[PDB]
Amino acid sequence: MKAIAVKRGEDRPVVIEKPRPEPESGEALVRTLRVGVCGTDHEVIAGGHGGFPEGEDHLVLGHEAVGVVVDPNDTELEEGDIVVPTVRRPPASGTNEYFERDQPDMAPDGMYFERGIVGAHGYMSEFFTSPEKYLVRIPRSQAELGFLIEPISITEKALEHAYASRSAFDWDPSSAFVLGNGSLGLLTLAMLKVDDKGYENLYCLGRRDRPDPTIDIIEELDATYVDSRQTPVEDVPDVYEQMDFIYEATGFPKHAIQSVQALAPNGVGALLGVPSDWAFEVDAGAFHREMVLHNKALVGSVNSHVEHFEAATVTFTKLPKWFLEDLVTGVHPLSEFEAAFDDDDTTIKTAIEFSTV
Amino acid sequence: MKAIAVKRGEDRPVVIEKPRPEPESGEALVRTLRVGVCGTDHEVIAGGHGGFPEGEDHLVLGHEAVGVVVDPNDTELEEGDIVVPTVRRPPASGTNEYFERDQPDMAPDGMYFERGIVGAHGYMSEFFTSPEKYLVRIPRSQAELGFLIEPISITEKALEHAYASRSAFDWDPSSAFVLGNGSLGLLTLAMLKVDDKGYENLYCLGRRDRPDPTIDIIEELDATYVDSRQTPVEDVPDVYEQMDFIYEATGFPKHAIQSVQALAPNGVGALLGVPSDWAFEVDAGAFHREMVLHNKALVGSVNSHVEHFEAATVTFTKLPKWFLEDLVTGVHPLSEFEAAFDDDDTTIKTAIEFSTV
Numbered sequence A, B: 001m002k003a004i005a006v007k008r009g010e011d012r013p014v015v016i017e018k019p020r021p022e023p024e025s026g027e028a029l030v031r032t033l034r035v036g037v038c039g040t041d042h043e044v045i046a047g048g049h050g051g052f053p054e055g056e057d058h059l060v061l062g063h064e065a066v067g068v069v070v071d072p073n074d075t076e077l078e079e080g081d082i083v084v085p086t087v088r089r090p091p092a093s094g095t096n097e098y099f100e101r102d103q104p105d106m107a108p109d110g111m112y113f114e115r116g117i118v119g120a121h122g123y124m125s126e127f128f129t130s131p132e133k134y135l136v137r138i139p140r141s142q143a144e145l146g147f148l149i150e151p152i153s154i155t156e157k158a159l160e161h162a163y164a165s166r167s168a169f170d171w172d173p174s175s176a177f178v179l180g181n182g183s184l185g186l187l188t189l190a191m192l193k194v195d196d197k198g199y200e201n202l203y204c205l206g207r208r209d210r211p212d213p214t215i216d217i218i219e220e221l222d223a224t225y226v227d228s229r230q231t232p233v234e235d236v237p238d239v240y241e242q243m244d245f246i247y248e249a250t251g252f253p254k255h256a257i258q259s260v261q262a263l264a265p266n267g268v269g270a271l272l273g274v275p276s277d278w279a280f281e282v283d284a285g286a287f288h289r290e291m292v293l294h295n296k297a298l299v300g301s302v303n304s305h306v307e308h309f310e311a312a313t314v315t316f317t318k319l320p321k322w323f324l325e326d327l328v329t330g331v332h333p334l335s336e337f338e339a340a341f342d343d344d345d346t347t348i349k350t351a352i353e354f355s356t357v
């Protein structure tokens, strides 16, 4: 079968061939329908070959997949079921408490592999296997855009943990501010619009000039576009208002620090970004005191698990049809896959189509 | 009646006289038994006269009080009841959502007064009044050390909110690290020893040379003393172990930042300290990435409310008798009150006694 992989020495993804996998006990064989591309994929392409699976000369890309079960093997899944796989699998040392307790999304570095990212081949191949316990059935009609279930799930987990931090008091937020206009930030903004918390005023940070299709999505959602070149995060309360909830999706370290200043009293910031080391002058006194005197929280989150993928299916049904149309700027057949890895301002979310149902 | 107050121009607390207060509807009159002194009191003494009550030339000190109800007025309290008052009262603008929803401990700056601290006279007077809703009955036998119920309550709230942040997953911590060896930190360390979470390994940060009575308390609790001059917070994982729970009670901004590096994956730091502005070089990239990749949280907390004061009574019963004996280094009669404000290394927790039961 064909697969899309990064190799040592190649700067871009390429097509390779390798045998179709055969399912082990407890696993099903899945025919890949579509696999999404996000910032994480570009980071893997830009990175080294450290994340390659032990003793292998490539890494098959892709962690946002939807497929059809073609062999349920000894599982309780059925032939023709539409499924989305979770990303984390046990490391070389085998199982551990995080996998045994069904919370591998909480495992620390070294205690998991992430398919398509670190230690294990991804899903950009014509077929893949996975344990049934890591295959989430989704509605048949979500097959077309089923590659969005994993990114939605990332936000579902982050909101779960951020909202948990506020659960000791009666928190009823009205304003929310997403930092970042990449596919995760824009998906998150639409999710916040329909969130059961009932946010009234939405904001999204970017650094684009008009005309720009991310600005257009932000504004079409009735949110306010905040250009960080004009209004830094710390100035947002003055220019706009204090934000009860902040979701950081830029990977820009200054936003982690300054979010505390933009939060309303009793607010929380969820942190999703994965920055490199970067040192500069910080008023740590102001950071520290504001957290305490106004009962604020910062919560970091990574990955997601089965309940979040299930929650994503319900949230998907509530997203506007225009928004899903505008978010997904290109679905590319495997025959012309390269354009899925385009990285310019008019590319928001892309996927590669391996097969149709 | 006599009261202990700070005045404009006096560097130290002094004795004043003012009329006994009369209870308004919904309030009881309380005879003060003992009032504790903590770092907050020293900060008020060191500060300006901005926190003085509107149009008054002094501020009566003290926010950690225990007294006996002498006139229940139109309340459901009884004559002879032992009570501890909460600290926050409505500001000049009157009631607001935080008071109406019984969560004034979540009110932001300007939307509360704190008795003995900002905007309202404290409890270091022979008598005081308070709404019955802000008087917490405690066991009669806690009268002697009833001034410890408010500080215990501060920790009860902070733990409630920090633990809430971890409630979306199965968190079962084993290590805890209190930063600070002042009365709040040492009380907190003893509380963590008996916490229902079942911590196995305890640590407390200070910067004292032996012999020192805070080191002795730390070690007598079977905790490890971490001298920050030897081992900075960021080095603690290497020298000791990663800490599932960190409670910051130093008011030192570097500890807010570095706590993230000392936390175990999935851990939380509670922040209690109230630092002034202070800017210096911070690796914000490392801070940000570690929060995210290891699902960590920082939660700030201030004040406390009725449920936390009730919880404190139960926790008090579990604290070792030797620990309560060693923590309280001096109870001073009003006749010789000045020594309660001693601020040297051998002074841990003090109180002033206004009357006996």
Ligand SMILES: NC(=O)c1ccc[n+]([C@@H]2O[C@H](COP(=O)([O-])OP(=O)(O)OC[C@H]3O[C@@H](n4cnc5c(N)ncnc54)[C@H](OP(=O)(O)O)[C@@H]3O)[C@@H](O)[C@H]2O)c1
Binding pocket: A038, A039, A040, A043, A154, A179, A180, A181, A182, A183, A184, A185, A205, A206, A207, A208, A228, A249, A250, A251, A252, A271, A272, A273, A274, A275, A301, A302, A303, B292
């Ligand atoms: N924690 C997790 O489980 C998880 C999962 C998925 C993704 N992530 C992380 O989430 C972040 C977002 O991912 P994505 O797929 O949306 O990535 P992305 O496509 O790279 O989007 C990041 C966006 O943030 C904008 N941005 C960066 N710095 C900015 C600044 N200073 N001011 C205003 N805008 C700024 C960028 O705008 P420009 O193009 O104009 O520069 C870009 O559009 C990444 O850091 C990624 O690694 C984490």
Ligand SMILES: NC(=O)c1ccc[n+]([C@@H]2O[C@H](COP(=O)([O-])OP(=O)(O)OC[C@H]3O[C@@H](n4cnc5c(N)ncnc54)[C@H](OP(=O)(O)O)[C@@H]3O)[C@@H](O)[C@H]2O)c1
Binding pocket: A292, B038, B039, B040, B043, B154, B179, B180, B181, B182, B183, B184, B185, B205, B206, B207, B208, B228, B249, B250, B251, B252, B271, B272, B273, B274, B275, B301, B302, B303
């Ligand atoms: N958020 C709230 O509701 C609330 C309530 C009460 C108190 N507080 C805050 O909690 C903090 C503790 O209060 P407290 O009554 O315990 O105050 P404290 O008596 O002043 O104690 C602070 C302790 O921290 C130690 N310390 C300071 N910097 C240090 C460092 N770099 N390394 C090691 N030890 C260090 C000090 O040691 P040395 O004496 O050796 O310098 C001191 O013993 C204060 O900042 C206070 O304002 C907040």
Ligand SMILES: [K+]
Binding pocket: A172, A173, A174, A197, A198, A199, A200
């Ligand atoms: K709302």
Ligand SMILES: [K+]
Binding pocket: A237, A238, A239, A240, A241, A242
């Ligand atoms: K404003």
Ligand SMILES: [K+]
Binding pocket: A194, A195, A196, A314, A315
């Ligand atoms: K939802």
Ligand SMILES: [K+]
Binding pocket: A343, A344, A345, A346, A347, A348
């Ligand atoms: K783009």
Ligand SMILES: [K+]
Binding pocket: none
């Ligand atoms: K650019």
Ligand SMILES: [K+]
Binding pocket: B172, B173, B174, B197, B198, B199, B200
């Ligand atoms: K435990």
Ligand SMILES: [K+]
Binding pocket: B237, B238, B239, B240, B241, B242
């Ligand atoms: K170690």
Ligand SMILES: [K+]
Binding pocket: B194, B195, B196, B314, B315
């Ligand atoms: K307890």
Ligand SMILES: [K+]
Binding pocket: B343, B344, B345, B346, B347, B348
């Ligand atoms: K002292």
Ligand SMILES: [K+]
Binding pocket: none
């Ligand atoms: K000293």
Ligand SMILES: [Zn+2]
Binding pocket: A037, A038, A039, A040, A041, A063, A064, A151
């Ligand atoms: Zn992705």
Ligand SMILES: [Zn+2]
Binding pocket: B037, B038, B039, B040, B041, B063, B064, B151
């Ligand atoms: Zn106090």
